[PDB]
Design a protein around this ligand. Sequence first.
Ligand SMILES: CCCCCCCCCCCCC/C=C/[C@@H](O)C(CO)NC(=O)CCCCCCC
Lengths: 271, 55, 55, 254, 254
Amino acid sequence: RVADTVGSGPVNSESIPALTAAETGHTSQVVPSDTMQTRHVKNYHSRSESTVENFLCRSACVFYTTYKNHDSDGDNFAYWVINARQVAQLRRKLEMFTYARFDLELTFVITSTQEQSTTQGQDTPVLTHQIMYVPPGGPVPTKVNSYSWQTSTNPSVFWTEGNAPPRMSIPFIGIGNAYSMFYDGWARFDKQGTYGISTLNSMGTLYMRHVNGGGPGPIVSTVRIYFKPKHVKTWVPRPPRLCQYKKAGNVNFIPTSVTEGRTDITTMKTT
Amino acid sequence: GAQVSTQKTGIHYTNINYYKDAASNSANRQDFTQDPGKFTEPVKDIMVKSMPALN
Amino acid sequence: GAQVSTQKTGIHYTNINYYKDAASNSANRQDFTQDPGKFTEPVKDIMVKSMPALN
Amino acid sequence: GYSDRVRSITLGNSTITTQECANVVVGYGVWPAYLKDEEATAEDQPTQPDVATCRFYTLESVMWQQGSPGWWWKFPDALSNMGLFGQNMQYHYLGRAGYTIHVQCNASKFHQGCLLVVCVPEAEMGCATLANKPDPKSLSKGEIASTFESQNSTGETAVQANVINAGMGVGVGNLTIFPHQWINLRTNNSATIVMPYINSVPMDNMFRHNNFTLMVIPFAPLSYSAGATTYVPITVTVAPMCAEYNGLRLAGKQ
Amino acid sequence: GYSDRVRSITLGNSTITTQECANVVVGYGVWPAYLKDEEATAEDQPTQPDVATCRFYTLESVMWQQGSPGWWWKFPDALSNMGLFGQNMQYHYLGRAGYTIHVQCNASKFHQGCLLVVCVPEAEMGCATLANKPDPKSLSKGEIASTFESQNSTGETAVQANVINAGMGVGVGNLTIFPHQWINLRTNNSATIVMPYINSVPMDNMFRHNNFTLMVIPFAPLSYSAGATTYVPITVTVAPMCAEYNGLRLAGKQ
Ligand SMILES: CCCCCCCCCCCCC/C=C/[C@@H](O)C(CO)NC(=O)CCCCCCC
């Protein structure tokens, strides 16, 4: 909840509530009660919706891929290296804090589309997919059927099209006491090579694939990944991203104006 | 072994956790902590509004 | 007739068994026993670290 | 007998005096201190040089001009060459420390201008060329200040130094969220910040990671009438606070 | 479960083990410790590196032979090049410290010989040439051992290294007044001394003064029958204890 207004009458003193020294770096705790007369107002407004928890706690697409039901050579499955910088929306949000800590709520929205052919007599059964997570170091799949899909240890989800979207929870899997949103450092101790957040980045890959081919007719399924931070903790606020994003592995940008211009320094007709 | 918390109004709601890993729980939104003194007034020296920042 | 156990943290969770065969229950992961003395120090003779293994 | 301008700070064999100041900004309200047994991972006993390292090192000066866009100094490194600090820094794998930054600049009652002194933790910067990564020399030059530009930087491996974005793709005028003070020639003389150790890990290497960058950008361009002294220098003085070190070995950096 | 031969010494990241020893000679019965406020003159606060400096540094080895007259190492300097010890040693005007000297040499049950390991404090040496003073390089070569001779040394500026007089004009067989242990291959394996700070002043410079010299002289010449391993090395390992430093400044030595 917000602070309510205090009743104010006229004043005559050597007290200077109106003047400070911004050079201090301290922000003024000046209310309207100073510098003007005010009535009394019991303010009930709540800041409940601007809590860090609520600002972040909302599913957001972070990526998506494709894969066919058919293809000789295996080669008809997809993968994606987990990371939250390939999407503009959420990245900018998470990047309003230097360090953060939170659990994640994974939600997948799987859909299938059928493409044009010549194939006839098609009466396709339900489609069942498989999303498999592979922690870093684990054996990665090669073809739509390499042994590794047994997931004897790697966790994964099986899902039949037509049902409620799949969903899981992930604990704070960070190595350090928190996730790092930025890293003004290098990977190797001789500053040679990778520079940027891209070095802290290392959370395994996600593998998708059709379990059953369905029919002989060509089909293309798409998997959408949705993150949703929970039980959040945030440290060190930062200036929101001004320039548009240019790369997923770094801060790179092309210089941008601070805002838009108007005619005079006096124009109320804002841009 | 459940728990009752008040709702967001201008009445409560019961709740039980069914999973073993606390990560499975829902977001805690009934939270309301706040310290602006970190970001504003981060001066080692306390400032009186009535007074000047130089004397 | 339920039971409350603590969750895995850095709060509990209620639970009831609905089936008659105990095999139907979920894996007991709140378990934490451990005896390395089986595999290490399986000697009939207790060894003092400060001392030598031959004297 | 005092003025909230007056000020005397002492650490080791060094001492700072302030005839004109505001206050002293203190990190995020957090004052630096030695790592507790509860927040530690490294099991070996740490070294606490103390006086030998936690003292005032004064970097090379820089000249302020009517066109100067700004300056910056990465920090874990910048002191990589300062006495026993830089040393303990070369012989150890891990280290953590706080700091007392003191930027000093003085003009006359007839000069005018205004500087912004900030401490950006984790100031990752972009490259001038979208496809590459900025080379080390472009990022930091130890005690030698690096410079921002009043325009777009160019190709190869330099940093996109255009000031309006602080080389981080943000609005330069918002840097004020990080610890800072203003040096307004008209009323100021020096600025002093107390940055505590800030990182997502109890300790870190010091040559591989710069946990924060000091930036001195002028928002109010320096000016003066003819006849006034023309050379107005800026001098940065920093002092490590509560420096611990772990993982001793031979010295260098890969 | 023990033997007054067994032995485990630990300081910092270093650890010493003794499968064959006598005891441990301790200075003049005095065990090293930090300078008290009552015996001090330097008013500035001292630095106590601790773990970073008070650890085991192992000098270059030397080969023992059937003719080897002996070896010696001046001490304040010898560690002038060892990690952070040597460093604190270059940045400070004053310093004081104790030591744990451990000389190690091993042969087989079929080898025979006997070494004398001593710590001569204030081991001023004479010149080979009466009229001059022995040059620095002849006095000490840091971690590189210097050698005694089985005869008279010669001219210019060398040291009168003839062993019978330990280059000090005394009877070599009397060095036993200073802290010492014997390494008698037949029953020994290592020798360990604990030299405390010994000087006529609470602290001293470390590059201008060598408060003691370690000497390893063989009284019983090494020997063995044909077929026995022929290379028998000697290795010195020393560890600073309770090192304090005062008067910090730039580094070097005039
Ligand atoms: C079937 C179930 C499948 C479950 C799959 C779970 C996959 C893991 C998803 C984790 C998402 C974490 C998002 C946190 C943001 C961090 O990426 C950032 C953001 O800039 N940088 C960083 O990279 C921070 C550096 C921290 C390093 C952590 C190492 C694990």
